Amino acid sequence: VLARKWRPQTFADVVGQEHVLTALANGLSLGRIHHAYLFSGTRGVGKTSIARLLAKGLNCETGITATPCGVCDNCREIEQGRFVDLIEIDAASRTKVEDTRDLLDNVQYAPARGRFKVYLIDEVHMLSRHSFNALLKTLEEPPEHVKFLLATTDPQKLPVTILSRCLQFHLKALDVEQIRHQLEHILNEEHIAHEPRALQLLARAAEGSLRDALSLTDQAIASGDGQVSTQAVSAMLGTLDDDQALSLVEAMVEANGERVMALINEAAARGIEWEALLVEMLGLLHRIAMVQLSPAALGNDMAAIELRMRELARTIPPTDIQLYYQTLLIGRKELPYAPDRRMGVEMTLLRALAFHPRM
Amino acid sequence: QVLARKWRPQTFADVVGQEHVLTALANGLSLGRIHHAYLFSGTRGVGKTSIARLLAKGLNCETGITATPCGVCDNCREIEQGRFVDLIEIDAASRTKVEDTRDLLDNVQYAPARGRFKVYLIDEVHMLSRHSFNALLKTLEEPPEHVKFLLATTDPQKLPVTILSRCLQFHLKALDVEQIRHQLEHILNEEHIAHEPRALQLLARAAEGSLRDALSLTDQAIASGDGQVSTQAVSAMLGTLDDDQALSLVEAMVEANGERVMALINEAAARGIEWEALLVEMLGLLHRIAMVQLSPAALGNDMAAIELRMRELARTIPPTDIQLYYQTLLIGRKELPYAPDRRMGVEMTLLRALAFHPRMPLPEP
Amino acid sequence: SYQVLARKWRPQTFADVVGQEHVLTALANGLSLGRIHHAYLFSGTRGVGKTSIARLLAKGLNCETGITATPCGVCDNCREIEQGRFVDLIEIDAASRTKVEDTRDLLDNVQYAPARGRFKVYLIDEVHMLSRHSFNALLKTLEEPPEHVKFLLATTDPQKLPVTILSRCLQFHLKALDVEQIRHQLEHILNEEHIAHEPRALQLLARAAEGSLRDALSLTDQAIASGDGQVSTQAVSAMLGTLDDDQALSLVEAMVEANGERVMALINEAAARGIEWEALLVEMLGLLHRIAMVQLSPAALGNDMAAIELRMRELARTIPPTDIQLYYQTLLIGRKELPYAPDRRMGVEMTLLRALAFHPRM
Amino acid sequence: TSRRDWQLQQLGITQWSLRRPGALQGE
Amino acid sequence: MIRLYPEQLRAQLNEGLRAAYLLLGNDPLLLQESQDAVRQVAAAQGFEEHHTFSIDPNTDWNAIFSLCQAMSLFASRQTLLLLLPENGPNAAINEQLLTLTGLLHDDLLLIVRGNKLSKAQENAAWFTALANRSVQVTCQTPEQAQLPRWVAARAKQLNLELDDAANQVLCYCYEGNLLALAQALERLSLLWPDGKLTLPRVEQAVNDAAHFTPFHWVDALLMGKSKRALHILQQLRLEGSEPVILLRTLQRELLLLVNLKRQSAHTPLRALFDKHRVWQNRRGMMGEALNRLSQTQLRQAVQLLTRTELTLKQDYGQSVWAELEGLSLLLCH
Amino acid sequence: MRWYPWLRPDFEKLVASYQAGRGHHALLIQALPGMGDDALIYALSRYLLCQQPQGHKSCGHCRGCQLMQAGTHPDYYTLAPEKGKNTLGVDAVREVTEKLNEHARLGGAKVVWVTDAALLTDAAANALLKTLEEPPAETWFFLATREPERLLATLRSRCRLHYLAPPPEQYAVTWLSREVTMSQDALLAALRLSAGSPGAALALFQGDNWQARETLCQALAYSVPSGDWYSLLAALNHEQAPARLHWLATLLMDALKRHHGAAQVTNVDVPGLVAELANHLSPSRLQAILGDVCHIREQLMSVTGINRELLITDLLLRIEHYLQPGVVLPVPHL
DNA sequence: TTTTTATAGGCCAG
DNA sequence: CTGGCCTATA
Ligand SMILES: Nc1ncnc2c1ncn2[C@@H]1O[C@H](COP(=O)(O)OP(=O)(O)O)[C@@H](O)[C@H]1O
Ligand SMILES: Nc1ncnc2c1ncn2[C@@H]1O[C@H](COP(=O)(O)OP(=O)(O)O)[C@@H](O)[C@H]1O
Ligand SMILES: Nc1ncnc2c1ncn2[C@@H]1O[C@H](COP(=O)(O)OP(=O)(O)O)[C@@H](O)[C@H]1O
Ligand code: BEF
Ligand code: BEF
Ligand code: BEF
Ligand SMILES: [Mg+2]
Ligand SMILES: [Mg+2]
Ligand SMILES: [Mg+2]
Ligand SMILES: [Zn+2]
Ligand SMILES: [Zn+2]
Ligand SMILES: [Zn+2]
Ligand SMILES: [Zn+2]
Numbered sequence A: 001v002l003a004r005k006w007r008p009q010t011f012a013d014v015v016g017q018e019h020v021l022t023a024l025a026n027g028l029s030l031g032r033i034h035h036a037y038l039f040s041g042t043r044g045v046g047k048t049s050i051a052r053l054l055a056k057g058l059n060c061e062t063g064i065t066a067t068p069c070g071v072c073d074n075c076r077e078i079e080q081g082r083f084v085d086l087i088e089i090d091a092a093s094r095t096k097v098e099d100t101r102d103l104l105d106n107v108q109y110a111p112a113r114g115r116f117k118v119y120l121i122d123e124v125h126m127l128s129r130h131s132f133n134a135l136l137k138t139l140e141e142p143p144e145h146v147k148f149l150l151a152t153t154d155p156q157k158l159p160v161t162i163l164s165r166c167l168q169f170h171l172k173a174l175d176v177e178q179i180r181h182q183l184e185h186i187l188n189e190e191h192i193a194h195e196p197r198a199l200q201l202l203a204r205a206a207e208g209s210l211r212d213a214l215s216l217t218d219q220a221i222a223s224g225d226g227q228v229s230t231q232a233v234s235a236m237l238g239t240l241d242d243d244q245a246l247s248l249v250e251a252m253v254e255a256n257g258e259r260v261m262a263l264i265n266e267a268a269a270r271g272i273e274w275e276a277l278l279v280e281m282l283g284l285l286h287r288i289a290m291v292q293l294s295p296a297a298l299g300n301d302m303a304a305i306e307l308r309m310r311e312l313a314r315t316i317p318p319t320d321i322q323l324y325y326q327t328l329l330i331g332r333k334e335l336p337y338a339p340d341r342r343m344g345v346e347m348t349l350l351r352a353l354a355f356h357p358r359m
Numbered sequence B: 001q002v003l004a005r006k007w008r009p010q011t012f013a014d015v016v017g018q019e020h021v022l023t024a025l026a027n028g029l030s031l032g033r034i035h036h037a038y039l040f041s042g043t044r045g046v047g048k049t050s051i052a053r054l055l056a057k058g059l060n061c062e063t064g065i066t067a068t069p070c071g072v073c074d075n076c077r078e079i080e081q082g083r084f085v086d087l088i089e090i091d092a093a094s095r096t097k098v099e100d101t102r103d104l105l106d107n108v109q110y111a112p113a114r115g116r117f118k119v120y121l122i123d124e125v126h127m128l129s130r131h132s133f134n135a136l137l138k139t140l141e142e143p144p145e146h147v148k149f150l151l152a153t154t155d156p157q158k159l160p161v162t163i164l165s166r167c168l169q170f171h172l173k174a175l176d177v178e179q180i181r182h183q184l185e186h187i188l189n190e191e192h193i194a195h196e197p198r199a200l201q202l203l204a205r206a207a208e209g210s211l212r213d214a215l216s217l218t219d220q221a222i223a224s225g226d227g228q229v230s231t232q233a234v235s236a237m238l239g240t241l242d243d244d245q246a247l248s249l250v251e252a253m254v255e256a257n258g259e260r261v262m263a264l265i266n267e268a269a270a271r272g273i274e275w276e277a278l279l280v281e282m283l284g285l286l287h288r289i290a291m292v293q294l295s296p297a298a299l300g301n302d303m304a305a306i307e308l309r310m311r312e313l314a315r316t317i318p319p320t321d322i323q324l325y326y327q328t329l330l331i332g333r334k335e336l337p338y339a340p341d342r343r344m345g346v347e348m349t350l351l352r353a354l355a356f357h358p359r360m361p362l363p364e365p
Numbered sequence C: 001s002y003q004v005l006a007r008k009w010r011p012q013t014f015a016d017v018v019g020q021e022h023v024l025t026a027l028a029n030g031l032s033l034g035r036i037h038h039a040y041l042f043s044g045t046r047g048v049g050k051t052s053i054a055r056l057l058a059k060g061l062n063c064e065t066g067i068t069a070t071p072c073g074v075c076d077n078c079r080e081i082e083q084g085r086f087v088d089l090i091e092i093d094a095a096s097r098t099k100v101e102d103t104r105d106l107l108d109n110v111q112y113a114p115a116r117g118r119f120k121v122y123l124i125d126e127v128h129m130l131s132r133h134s135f136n137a138l139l140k141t142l143e144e145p146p147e148h149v150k151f152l153l154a155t156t157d158p159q160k161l162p163v164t165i166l167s168r169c170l171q172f173h174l175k176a177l178d179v180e181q182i183r184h185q186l187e188h189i190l191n192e193e194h195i196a197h198e199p200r201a202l203q204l205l206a207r208a209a210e211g212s213l214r215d216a217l218s219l220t221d222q223a224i225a226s227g228d229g230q231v232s233t234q235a236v237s238a239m240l241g242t243l244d245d246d247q248a249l250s251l252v253e254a255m256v257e258a259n260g261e262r263v264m265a266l267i268n269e270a271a272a273r274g275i276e277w278e279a280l281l282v283e284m285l286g287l288l289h290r291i292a293m294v295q296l297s298p299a300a301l302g303n304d305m306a307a308i309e310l311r312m313r314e315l316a317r318t319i320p321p322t323d324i325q326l327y328y329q330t331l332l333i334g335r336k337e338l339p340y341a342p343d344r345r346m347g348v349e350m351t352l353l354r355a356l357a358f359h360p361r362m
Numbered sequence D: 001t002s003r004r005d006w007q008l009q010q011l012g013i014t015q016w017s018l019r020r021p022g023a024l025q026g027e
Numbered sequence E: 001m002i003r004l005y006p007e008q009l010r011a012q013l014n015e016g017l018r019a020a021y022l023l024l025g026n027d028p029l030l031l032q033e034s035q036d037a038v039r040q041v042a043a044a045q046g047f048e049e050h051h052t053f054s055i056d057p058n059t060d061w062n063a064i065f066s067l068c069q070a071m072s073l074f075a076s077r078q079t080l081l082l083l084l085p086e087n088g089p090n091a092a093i094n095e096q097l098l099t100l101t102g103l104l105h106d107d108l109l110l111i112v113r114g115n116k117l118s119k120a121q122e123n124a125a126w127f128t129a130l131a132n133r134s135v136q137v138t139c140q141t142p143e144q145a146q147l148p149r150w151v152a153a154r155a156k157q158l159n160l161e162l163d164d165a166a167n168q169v170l171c172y173c174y175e176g177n178l179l180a181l182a183q184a185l186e187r188l189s190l191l192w193p194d195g196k197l198t199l200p201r202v203e204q205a206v207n208d209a210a211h212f213t214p215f216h217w218v219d220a221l222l223m224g225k226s227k228r229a230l231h232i233l234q235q236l237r238l239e240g241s242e243p244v245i246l247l248r249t250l251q252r253e254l255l256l257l258v259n260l261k262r263q264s265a266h267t268p269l270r271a272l273f274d275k276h277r278v279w280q281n282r283r284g285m286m287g288e289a290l291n292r293l294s295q296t297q298l299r300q301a302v303q304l305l306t307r308t309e310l311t312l313k314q315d316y317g318q319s320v321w322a323e324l325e326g327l328s329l330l331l332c333h
Numbered sequence F: 001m002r003w004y005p006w007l008r009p010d011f012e013k014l015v016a017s018y019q020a021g022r023g024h025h026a027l028l029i030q031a032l033p034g035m036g037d038d039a040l041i042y043a044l045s046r047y048l049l050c051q052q053p054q055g056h057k058s059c060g061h062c063r064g065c066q067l068m069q070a071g072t073h074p075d076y077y078t079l080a081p082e083k084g085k086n087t088l089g090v091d092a093v094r095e096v097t098e099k100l101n102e103h104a105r106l107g108g109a110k111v112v113w114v115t116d117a118a119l120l121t122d123a124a125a126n127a128l129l130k131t132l133e134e135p136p137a138e139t140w141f142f143l144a145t146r147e148p149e150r151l152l153a154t155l156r157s158r159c160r161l162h163y164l165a166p167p168p169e170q171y172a173v174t175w176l177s178r179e180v181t182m183s184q185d186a187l188l189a190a191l192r193l194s195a196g197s198p199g200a201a202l203a204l205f206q207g208d209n210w211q212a213r214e215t216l217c218q219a220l221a222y223s224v225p226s227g228d229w230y231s232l233l234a235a236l237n238h239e240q241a242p243a244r245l246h247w248l249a250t251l252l253m254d255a256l257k258r259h260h261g262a263a264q265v266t267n268v269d270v271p272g273l274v275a276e277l278a279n280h281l282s283p284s285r286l287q288a289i290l291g292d293v294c295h296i297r298e299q300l301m302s303v304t305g306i307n308r309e310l311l312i313t314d315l316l317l318r319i320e321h322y323l324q325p326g327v328v329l330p331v332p333h334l
Numbered sequence G: 001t002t003t004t005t006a007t008a009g010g011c012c013a014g
Numbered sequence H: 001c002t003g004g005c006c007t008a009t010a
Helices: A018-029 A047-059 A073-080 A097-103 A129-139 A176-190 A196-205 A210-223 A230-239 A244-253 A257-270 A274-291 A306-314 A318-334 A341-354 B019-030 B048-059 B074-080 B098-106 B130-141 B177-190 B197-206 B211-225 B231-238 B244-254 B258-270 B275-294 B304-316 B319-335 B342-356 C021-033 C050-062 C076-082 C100-108 C132-143 C179-192 C199-209 C213-227 C233-239 C246-256 C260-273 C277-296 C303-307 C309-318 C321-336 C344-356 D003-011 E006-015 E028-044 E094-101 E125-130 E147-157 E164-174 E178-191 E199-204 E215-223 E226-238 E243-266 E269-275 E280-292 E295-313 E320-330 F005-020 F037-048 F063-069 F090-099 F122-133 F169-179 F184-193 F200-206 F209-226 F230-236 F241-258 F271-280 F283-302 F308-323
Strands: A036-040 A117-122 A146-151 A167-170 A355-358 B037-041 B087-091 B118-123 B147-153 B168-171 C039-043 C091-093 C120-125 C149-155 C170-173 D015-018 E002-004 E020-025 E050-054 E078-083 E108-114 E135-139 F026-030 F076-079 F110-114 F139-145 F160-163
Touching: A018 A047, A018 A167, A018 E178, A036 A047, A047 A073, A047 A117, A047 A146, A097 A129, A167 E178, A176 A196, A176 A210, A196 A210, A196 A230, A210 A230, A210 B019, A210 B168, A230 B019, A244 A257, A244 A274, A244 A306, A244 A318, A244 A341, A257 A341, A257 B275, A274 A306, A274 A318, A274 A341, A274 E320, A318 A341, A318 A355, A341 A355, A341 B275, A341 B319, A355 B319, B019 B048, B019 B168, B037 B048, B048 B074, B048 B087, B048 B118, B048 B147, B087 C132, B098 B130, B177 B197, B177 B211, B197 B211, B197 B231, B211 B231, B211 C021, B211 C170, B231 C021, B244 B258, B244 B275, B244 B304, B244 B319, B244 B342, B258 B342, B258 C277, B275 B304, B275 B319, B275 B342, B319 B342, B319 D015, B342 C277, B342 C321, B342 D003, C021 C050, C021 C170, C039 C050, C050 C076, C050 C120, C050 C149, C091 F122, C100 C132, C179 C199, C179 C213, C199 C213, C199 C233, C213 C233, C213 F005, C213 F160, C246 C260, C246 C277, C246 C309, C246 C344, C260 C344, C277 C309, C277 C321, C277 C344, C303 C309, C321 C344, C321 D003, C344 F241, C344 F283, E002 E006, E006 E028, E006 E135, E006 E147, E020 E028, E028 E050, E028 E078, E028 E108, E028 E135, E028 E178, E094 E125, E147 E164, E147 E178, E164 E178, E164 E199, E178 E199, E215 E226, E215 E243, E215 E280, E215 E320, E226 E320, E243 E269, E243 E280, E243 E295, E243 E320, E243 F308, E269 E280, E295 E320, E295 F308, F005 F037, F026 F037, F037 F063, F037 F110, F037 F139, F076 F090, F090 F122, F169 F184, F169 F200, F184 F200, F184 F241, F200 F209, F209 F230, F209 F241, F209 F271, F230 F241, F230 F308, F241 F271, F241 F283, F283 F308
Parallel strands: A036 A146, A036 A167, A117 A146, B037 B147, B037 B168, B087 B118, B118 B147, C039 C149, C039 C170, C091 C120, C120 C149, E002 E135, E020 E108, E020 E135, E050 E078, E078 E108, F026 F139, F026 F160, F076 F110, F110 F139
Antiparallel strands: A355 D015
16 A cells, blocks of 8 residues: 555655654754654644654664664664564553553563663544543653653643643644655656646645545556546546535636536535535635635635635625625525425526526 | 345446446456555445445455456355355444444454455444544554455545545445436346336436435335336326426416416316425426526436427526526425415415416406 | 223224325235335324334234235234234334434344244334434344344434435335315214214314324314213314304405404404414415405305305405415414414414505505 | 515515526527 | 742742742643642652642542641651642632641642632631742733743743744744743754744744633724634634633623613713723723724624524524624624 | 312313223313413322222322322322423433333322423423323323424324313403402403413512513603613513513504504503503504514523523614614514 | 533443 | 543534
């Protein structure tokens, strides 16, 4: 699997995420090493891949280095998966306290193979109230030979009393190019045909996550019987469109009858609850209407959709917008009574596209 | 016996549509490029559960890892009969809790008995607690060589994004009316069963995308029609009346002709058609008209028998006019509940039409 | 050993079931075609034969005579189903036992072959009540049960069930019972029970049932009490708050005449006589309907109205079609929002008021 | 505002009317 | 009772340790850093046995009788820590405390962690008899005004040099969450040994994580700062607050505004502020609001606030957050 | 709980059917509050849990009724809402549905009394369905509401309805004049506010309540001529709001009735207020306001936990807006 | 100084 | 197998 094989073994192999690497690089380099680090951010952006790396760099036979060699008994042992002193707890399956207490009875004994006993607790947000307490008591009096590496997607769930005991690195989600350049590299290496604009399409679709990315790519290879072609990539991503709701709003304003009748028909295939489609649209117009009252009303949230949203606010009369809303908000109240529910959305969009309510 | 069950496809050959899914998996199997987490989504009855099973069945075919499983080696036949030691189908809707998931976890490490792979097909997978979802996380990210994970669910919407970034996601598309029909034919043919052509066109529409829904309707259609799948039988069961009478009422209405309207209602009343239903075929018709006006290639395939006439209506009557009749019948539906009498209620609604009729209102004093 | 007619008279053989002939047909048909499903969902409004039928479908599958459409009711099996004492129709009160753990027990005890019966038949009734989770639990089993298992699903409100659940059933919407259907029955029952009845009284009951055989038997039983043994046109009509024709029309009239003082005072007189307010509105809604009907073709006024016809025709001649529609709607709406207003009376008074001031156009 | 147009208001029957015939007629 | 700011504490704790250490406040980062500043200087002065206890109304009269028994000489020095209930010292435990105020060795060191106490709780005999022995730290977070100062102060303690420009940017991003702020600084000193933290450098290694209360939002509206309001909302959602709580706290204000607006015609601004016992600090801010919004705009707000409530508790609508994004904007024209 | 004299007939008829043995197992009595439905039920309850009855009456001296006098009769279940709450939860119905199967703990019949079916939850209503349709033997149900039509569809077809109709007003006034010393006008008004049920009438006089209507009247008297209705917030915003609103709506309607010169008004006791309302408010607004008053009332009563102050405050500002000339007024829906 | 409710599913320590 | 606690959905 692409996602597995292309896990970064050397810092050099890691994409972006530089504000994290560097500070680690340098702390190792310049003898600064906290008893415990926390790595957060979104699915598949480096959290654990880096956590593993910090272990390599902490125990490398060449010494505590920012640039682990990835060729010593230790680096290949870790890279392999079985290193005496690399304890990577799957916090998500072993969360009850019994198991955390038993993990930390052995914390005291000296490390067999290497410089540090490195505990790498991954998906750590899952540990119980009590289990956190156990950890805590060990973090408040950390054995010298021990270092803790906490990685979670959702940090907000750790107690203040533990986030206050970790140096926390929030990994940023990856940049569209950042993902693309990495996708080129890997396909290139694996010896696989690709087009320019095929990859531009996958990096976008990843929505910032390098794993989503290779997982998407893996699939893409199969759709392409060995070639990652735009012809194929675009088809596949069309299989998985969230789109519809925004996409309809767009073709709604422009007044594109076919595009509308077609999206409605695409949405059909996705297999959508129709009432829910209206609601997403309505929500969509709401947001927009308000981007028309400050640039500030667009989310940290949004991002993926965001480009499209802003343009749409720029190029539609705010008075036109409240109008579209009315028409949709209405068609919703009518949905149960329209013959079909599909039919009721279709009718609502005609109403919105072409007609005007006189009152 | 039961069609829904008897026809669950046994090879990729037998899977309806979903080319984009079958085509990847086969391409990938023959390509030797195989993931360890496959996720399957789509509305009910579009083939996910049965596709997933085919994948397991093809992963473990004694002939080799092939997209064309043989259906005769001990491994294939025993997957068919659901008693194959190494395809562990977990009803995730009853093994939802963590402890249950942990048990599935513990017993992963152990090697398969009789197969190339221990394949866990976790069906209705959206039901797992939050807890048992993350339980799955790391083990799904990096499993052992001999382990594969087949997940499948109606809505993938519910699975944490962490789970999602770890799988191939295959979204089965709902079925064309044509597709459903063709299968319904094949099956009724194979099962040797009399059928009127149009009775199928009718079921596949009522199936609303779902090949099961359709087989479920056919099953009860066969029973309703007495070993025959007849048009009368299907439209009986469906609340449909066969299209003429419906339209004829629209027509009479746009034509402002009251006598005919009330007659046509009386005649429908003799057939004891259920009132709300009638109203609805009328809204159905108006809507398709109003649509035909938008895009012309929009008029439905199924209503050939009436296209001539429909088209005419869409051509002759002002859009802003149809918006009238539609709305009028629509709040008419909103009313039927409370009207004194459901007949009365429909009638009264069309009388309302007549009085506000855009072109030849009812006569004033 | 007394039980309400609505209970005593529960159809015990397919023969003794009223209407729903399309359901019984498909059913008896399937049994006889050997085409038996594993998931039967039964729907319709209150008291039309849902659970009654389900239980009859159970009898037939289990009958000592064989799998039949026409179950005897004379074997250890049928008699035990009639009495609930039958070990092999596990009948679940879904609305009471809704939780997952509850229905996961159900699932675990499925695999097990049936006791003294041929099929193990679950009858989840009031099924729209199973938790979200409980529905999904059944999905995998409901789709692929053991050959010895049959699922029977009845509910009033099938709207609520997951489409995943629906995709896995044969669904049978029972139609509401025709007014006639209900009466003929009602007649029959009172005959057999040896109770005296006047035909027109039966007519009123079947109407008030509003589609529903249980509703009917329940009002019937109510009849018998407040009637002192007899179900008389007198007693039933006084019970149901039935109108004497004059009163409604007079209102309708005073309303279009815009005559406030008289609409209001007319109501006051009604309130004294203790009329069912919802009754009044319906009857006016009924009167407004003819009126708009007569305008269409003069002939449309029935042989029934002879007494009124005179007053009706005027109303039809004078008041615009258009304007009547307003009147009718305003009253319909008011019937809708009736039980929500502070008094029922007030609800009526406000409705007449709103409608009152329609009269002069401009 | 006709008296009819008024009655339609009272009745909840919302009147719809064109505004962009352009994207209709033309396919 | 030596009253301290957590910064100042480090110096006062070295001069001489004292029998009672009182850590009062609301901020988590000031609490740990101050609690760990003491645990550190306790072990250094020969303290090994460190005993922690969390005080609920749950702690029996059996769990406070194992605590007063806890100190018997001669024991190698032991540090007892006592955690608080939300309410602070209740009548049940305001008395348990008394019992401990007299048991004060150089062998036993008292530490106490909790919120701020109501003044009467504070002046309860036992507290003021501890007084001359006890040191007390204020661990109230800084607000938008007091903050940047505390940033540049802790900045110069880590001897890094912060730009006016970067201080502004840290304070936006970590307002209300000092701990993330601190770790931000640490993170930056590891990024750059330079110590020099440019606006453009600092900008690149920051993530947006401010913690607000709903009060931060009504205040925001009251003053008309909307880009703030919107920020506060977006953040409040992400910490997952119950919207109901927003609704009700905006209301307590919105409805006072309405009643003030009218009454304003008849009597002078100040009289009405007095009438309604409006907190002094708020009163300036309220004026501003009053002066900005029309008696009608208020009427609209009130109406729109009702639209959302009903939409919330009857229509079980999703909308709710959007409906507030709007309502916010409205109260800013 | 009191026993009122207009119950004797309604009781005797009902008991008669039970006494035949041919009584119906799920009775549903519909009655206005104050109408004393509970006492009819209690009376029928005592009758059933009587092992040695004396005609229509309960003895006092059998082991059965001693227990019943002293609250704790093992076979006598009361479904009312928890103390703090105003709904009637499913869990509580399920205990009763469960226990009901255990053979009667005293070996008499079992009676279950649902004080107000109006208060059953959706889940709680349905829970009751199957036990109600066919309950174990010798089990008797009693249910009471204001408005059957507000009651679940199916729950309803399992019941026998009994309408407890209120006595003639003449009688009612005469009753009242004995229990309180008020002006005949006041009584008739009180009685009329309360949909004709004496006692429910009487109530108004008993509680702090009547003084409180005078204060709505006091404050209305000012709001009308001054166009200041937000002034009313004070008199309306209280726990009993839906009750006080109803008062305000009846005042509004009487006004509207005068604009039509109608004979009966409801608030016979303050025809001054009724007038000043017909004088400074056009019928158009009288009625549009009557409208929102009633509607906000529903919500105050039907929405669980909704904020009173916020709703009532809206209603009042919005009414003032209606008072503006040319503003668009509301027209009911669907 | 921070709040709707009724009903369900669910994790967890001892 | 209880009581403390968190969650989602309508
Ligand atoms: N910064 C990165 N550089 C290179 N590959 C990455 C990066 N982030 C994620 N990936 C890809 O995702 C896979 C898993 O990433 P991982 O670090 O486990 O994410 P997480 O933070 O969610 O645990 C890696 O094997 C790699 O293919
Ligand atoms: N793509 C398909 N091709 C053929 N039959 C199908 C297909 N999808 C559904 N069916 C029919 O529906 C039944 C159940 O299909 P299934 O795959 O279980 O749907 P789901 O995806 O919801 O689990 C099968 O027995 C089969 O007859
Ligand atoms: N179709 C019918 N034929 C005869 N009796 C009926 C019919 N429908 C309802 N009833 C009467 O209604 C009572 C309850 O009917 P039931 O089938 O339980 O309704 P439900 O569908 O609401 O569960 C029975 O006692 C029976 O007398
Ligand atoms: F492994 Be990551 F947190 F998706
Ligand atoms: F029936 Be499917 F799995 F939704
Ligand atoms: F009353 Be029934 F079961 F709908
Ligand atoms: Mg990870
Ligand atoms: Mg399936
Ligand atoms: Mg039933
Ligand atoms: Zn190395
Ligand atoms: Zn094979
Ligand atoms: Zn038999
Ligand atoms: Zn007795």
